[PDB]
Symmetry: D2
Subunit: 494 residues, 4 copies
């Protein structure tokens, strides 16, 4: 049951959001927002830069001051506000789903059922934590009374990527707001609209002014202004590894702000001969092709046991036939475009690279259509570990199938990346499922499924796939700062 997309979609909010009112950019500058499906300009957005971030950081810092409403209201009240924001999003579900599909080239049915549904489920999950974050009373040595407080950190800068604009938006501000921080959010330049529309809803729900500030713009101007800012307490960033490296370096040189990073993945799936081959093919296929492969956790290398390798490749190639490229808003369409020309060129150069190296093409390998950034779902088999397609983050509807015979060998090969973050494991054997998932150097391990993202589980990576976990009970505490209070008393009793 999916309604049709809002026929006449109007872009209403295009300005900077600070202190619950809309601002022009200090520079007077605007910048175009494209439609990755048609290459036509949807609208123009005010272009924030360092000065606009300064306005936004002062707003948030002021909203965080001792005694001000956001600091003095009940924690459950912060929950009710987050719950109400979820209800507003449920009411405005069709609008947002249309805007997300239109602007981010996302298949509409997916934007409506999974993106928005996940946004609402995650916000309600975070809403529930607000008055359940607790500190401890500790029975430490001596005649003293020791307790801790889980206080909000302060001003949190949050840089959102373009592949899941609303989901990442909610996954970042939900925990931050639940813990009582205030935020300055910089959405990706390719996809600012859905965040700006959510800002109008944040206004409607009654969050105190300055608690949420949104400054759209480019990375090397507004993202950098956030990361090197001297009055920002934490920056959270999801995106490429190289920019994340720049973020930790800028934070270290600026004011030693806390940093959490979520970098890309080269996430492996291991398919054992004793796996349910249909479930394995369906989930591995889903894991690399969902949202045109632009997921953080894309299953970009699939290791299959030699006994079942040929049958697996056959079915994988058989499954890629069902895709239908075109406008994400048209019914029946399965696969939208990649977000822009930079990614389109990157993916195409990689597919050409795989062909030059020893690699077997089973389907795809080129672009699709004359307008938009479309890539045929491509499946490479006989991939070896030394190929570019086997080492570089693809972020495209390209599947690499590899072979393995030994358990130890595939564990070493799978872990032999600088990425951690995620992995897939398919087996019906109890021992192997446990021992292998223990051995994989990955932040999330799915067994006999893939990309089952929920709000109750913490998600984050090992190695250079990131810093920190988001959206768990553990994810919520990463937005608190611990304070120990130790009060001298005359005599302590247990």
């Amino acid at each position: 049951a999916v309604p049709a997309p809002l026929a006449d979609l109007k872009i209403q909010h295009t300005k900077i959001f600070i202190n619950n009112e809309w601002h022009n950019s200090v520079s007077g500058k605007k910048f175009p927002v494209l439609n990755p499906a048609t290459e036509e300009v949807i609208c123009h957005v005010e272009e924030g830069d360092k000065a606009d971030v300064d306005k936004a950081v002062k707003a948030a810092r002021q909203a965080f001051q001792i005694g001000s409403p956001w600091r003095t209201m009940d924690a459950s009240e912060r929950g009710r506000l987050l719950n109400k924001l979820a209800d507003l999003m449920e009411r405005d579900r069709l609008l947002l789903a249309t805007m997300e599909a239109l602007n981010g080239g996302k298949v509409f049915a997916n934007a409506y059922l999974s993106d928005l549904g996940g946004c609402i489920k995650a916000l309600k999950y975070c809403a529930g934590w607000a008055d359940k974050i607790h500190g401890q009373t500790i029975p430490s040595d001596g005649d003293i009374f020791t307790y801790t407080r889980r206080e909000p950190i302060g001003v949190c800068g949050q840089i959102i990527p373009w592949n899941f604009p609303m989901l990442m938006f909610i996954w970042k501000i939900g925990p931050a707001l639940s813990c009582g921080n205030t935020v300055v959010v910089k959405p990706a330049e390719q996809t600012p609209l859905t965040a700006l529309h959510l800002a109008s809803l944040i206004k409607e729900a009654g969050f105190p002014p300055g608690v949420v500030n949104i400054v759209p713009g480019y990375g090397p101007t507004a993202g950098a202004a956030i990361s090197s800012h001297m009055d920002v307490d934490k920056v959270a960033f999801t995106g490429s590894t190289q920019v994340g490296k720049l973020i930790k370096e800028a934070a270290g040189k600026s004011n030693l702000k806390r940093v959490t990073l979520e970098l890309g993945g080269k996430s492996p799936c291991i398919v054992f001969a004793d796996a349910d081959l249909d479930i394995a093919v369906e989930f591995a296929h889903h894991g690399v092709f969902y949202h045109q492969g632009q997921c953080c956790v894309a299953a970009s290398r699939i290791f299959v046991e030699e006994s079942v390798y040929d049958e697996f490749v056959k079915r994988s190639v058989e499954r890629a036939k069902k895709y239908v490229l075109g406008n994400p808003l048209t019914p029946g369409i399965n696969q939208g475009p990649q977000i822009d020309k930079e990614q389109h060129d990157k993916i195409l150069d990689l597919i050409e690279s795989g062909k030059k190296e020893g690699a077997k093409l089973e389907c795809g390998g080129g672009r699709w259509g004359n307008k938009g950034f479309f890539v045929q779902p491509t499946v490479f088999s006989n991939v070896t570990d030394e190929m570019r397609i086997a080492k570089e983050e693809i972020f495209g509807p390209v599947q690499q199938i590899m072979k393995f015979k030994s358990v130890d060998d595939v564990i070493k090969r799978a872990n032999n990346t600088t990425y951690g973050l995620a992995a897939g494991l398919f087996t019906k054997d109890l021992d192997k499922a446990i021992t292998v998932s223990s051995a994989l150097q990955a932040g999330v391990v799915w067994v006999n499924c893939y990309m089952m993202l929920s709000a109750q589980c913490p998600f984050g990576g090992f190695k250079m796939s990131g810093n920190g976990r988001e959206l768990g009970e553990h994810g919520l505490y990463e937005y608190t700062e611990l304070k120990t209070v130790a009060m001298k008393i005359s005599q302590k009793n247990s």
Copy 2:
């Protein structure tokens, strides 16, 4: 590496332990402690009663007063004292292992390696918890500061069985003492000696007087006195289901005291055709025969899928013929006696009942020797659910094997008991292991193993197998009382 037993063993502590002092019973009566197998009298120990329990409760309440040493010392010191008791136990490992094997008819190598080893490891675990028990600072509504305190409960009466005197003793006092309680223990009438000897070690370790009190004597005289006492704050009891009913009932009538019960089981094992046959046979055997089948959690019913049923029975009988009965102190002896004649007659009546009810006797069925309480390792096959041996806790070296063909049938049949203490599950399939263990109404579910009892895990009984769990993080907190403190403040901030 097992040493020989203390050659000529002398028992030095036979009186009541109160306020770190040895006492005669108020009446002066003493009672005999027997040696299973030889049926000889080891010595006579003071018989505790209501007058004695009253002395002990008075001591425990004094030791618990606000401002006393046990209440004002650092939690870490309570831990260090627990740690000191553990080292003392290790120094005296050989002595205590002999006394345990002598008094409880326990195979000496078993008492020395597993009983003493487990006691020391559990004492060290509880020691580690003493200063890590914490309360919470809670962000409740309104301008208030709310926190909780995990106070000790108070005076805890603890009634110990005869099957594992030392392990059960440490499992009760360890958590209780770690949290800062004071305790009055009534060890089993059959096996009081080892507990008394630990009492001497408790004095040596430096525990304040009255923190640990031990009252040997009978169940219906000193245990009843503990359970119905008006100034005992909690009673913890391990034993029969009927005595547990009697204890909770008296607790209701006397003063609403906290109660924890650990009752018997009819703990079933499910062996699926996809199981590792030898692991299943070996572990099921261990779970039904360990310590002459008088085990806390004995695997009496073994349900095997028909495909594997006959092969399982074959290997089970082959493994059952590998025992050597006799004096637990003689080297080479595998099976000692049952703890006394009462248990011996019960087991034998059930064996014949099984044969008369039409169960196939595969090996065993009768007594051994003229002296002692010995039972030949017995294996019954073709057992049906309406058979008595399939319904009464045999608490003996008797194994019952049943057949099953349907998963839901066997889940229902294993759960169809008034007991829910433990369960065993044997499979190599991931899905069956997780879902079947979820459906089992058991406090502990072992998969492809059995009787893997560690200190880090709580054991929580279901249904009438008990009330509460011990020895985990959850077990330590059951010996605390929670206190909420709510302080009005002029203004609160997050």
Copy 3:
């Protein structure tokens, strides 16, 4: 900002609620429900008995079977339903507030603002916990993977009092459902109406059938059937100490169910000379007089330091003469009636006891009116610890003012009654606040306030004031049963 009460209030639901349908009593008997202000019959309710509880327990057991919707739905889904119940309660706030006031003689403004507000707030708090209840993965010894599961217990019988029918209702069912249990509720005979109306709303929110059952009736028939039922896993009971003794005893006599009790109190207030006397008087008055002094946490003993004793009594008498008694639905009325004639008799007799005991009666001391059960707000001074009013919970608008001069003695005196549910402490000294509240034997200690019972804090009981806590994080976990799963593995890694 309190609207006018429903003039009409036609009472719709008067029957037994089982399986989302309405049932007459198996016997056909009904029983009358009074209006304590006018003593005229509001309506007749079906009189449930053992047979009706048996119907209800079977319904709840069926709803709890493995594979049922209540067992298989997502925990967040249970939360979603609890939240839907809260919104419905919000919609019917005016109706339910009128019904609460009509049936329980509660001042309408209080029922609308404080009772319903707390009911919605506690439900939303419980809603938020459903999917945040977690078990542990434990690093226990050996090549094992050990984890625990917090399962729902099963069928929970919940026996509700008459003083806060809706609040207690939500406090018992909110946690039990949040954890995934099913419940059989027995509301007080004097006050079944709001619970039955809540049931219709549970039907409307969409809870699966059998998850909530309500069997109105008397205590010694339907409450007893719950407490002694052979298929009920837990009973939670709020009420008198003597009946609590019966419930704990009955649970022991049949099937050893888990038990939680919250009994009366004789909660003390300690007022130190440096306390803010204005604030101390205001809160002490509120804590003893609120809802005609029928709270479990009534502050009926007030110890004032000699320095401030007379000034305190002066203001208490000034504040106590300020009530306007009458029908709780009429606007302006400050004090409603007692719940029924039995309590009216007891409280008046206690008033007579105090005067013949040589207590200085300052105001009140008699009946009010000639319709209903009204009691003049009474204040006694110069009360001694040996007086009847000083040991017995009066449950009426009777205030006892006492004197103390040394802290050590007054802590002794405050902790010296058979109840320890709660306490108040008024002082500006940091050391006094921490040390005295640590020394007070009470489940909740309020400092410089009283009766600020939020949904985030658990409020437990000491001594004979009960067993267990509710409505905290601690409170929710008591509606779970712990299960340890231990899976043998080929090799474990840290």
Copy 4:
């Protein structure tokens, strides 16, 4: 009982410690270790560099590989090993205290009772945590079973300062080893000896080869080699702010390793008019001069309310004239030297800044003695906020006293730092104790005391005073990596 120091003290371990074997530096260079009291060379130590660090990281990485002893032993074993190291430290308590006192110019009595005692207590606390670190089982949406694992992070580099070399050594490796990491420690150039002697004790205790590696050397060679190493998973650092900036930057540029810094604050005290003047004086000095004011948490600003200002300064000057400067091992000496000449010049220039900027110095202000770097106990009065001594971090006995008139004025001035490590608060007022301590932007707030550190409380800072906590439950989890395992299952039950 404080014993006499080691007379015949031989330095035995002076080389690089890798794989439980002693190494010469790859270059063959040694570097001298001086005695800060006499400026005499104590000995020469192997000078580690990049090559020596690379060896240590290969050793630690190998010791961390799956299947290695350190990864496969029970967590409780890691605990027993740490406990044995503590017992060893207790046995060699006199040796370590003299070696520590001699090498770090620390008063012998302090090194023996406070430095060693804390090291042993901290180690035992960490030992207790090893097998109590747990993950969670989460009830997330869908037919899944989700759990988390708290794994060890991997190879941890730990860079130690010279002020509390043993204490800092223990605070870093104790938690790291409790969780199962392997570590490469780089002590300060000034104080490598006690770390090397503990390395020998770690061999004796039975730690597997490579789990603890120690590489002495200089900061910009050996520390830098650690922080930028591509195979080190975390760096923990205690030291100056401008080095922490460099470390955080090196981590970002190399392999985005985790970073935890503990920098040193300007920790302020608020002395209220109602404070206990004597104790405030005693503890406020205690906090800034302890160990010649080289403490991790120095009380470098003392704000006093006008009402008690002058008398407070008098007592401060009076108590400051009670010390005996000289050799720390000599009995009776109360104040030792600063660690070196570089520190000595920094301290003296700050005093010159103090006089020139116009603060009233009551005592001290110059060099002391003809040998060594000794600094007279200096007290400055009437200091203002923009003065170097009030804003530039002082490591020295220089004490700063100021006045305040409005409470928020002083809270602003106290929070007007880029440092938030600690704070002091002296008052008897319940409301101010809570409200002011919540308002202070500091990681630890002491009330009516100072520098009462412990192993049970988590320790770390706000703002530029560091990130992360040590030695708490929160401190132990900082050495773990979170992994979510999500296993799809056929049907889920609560």
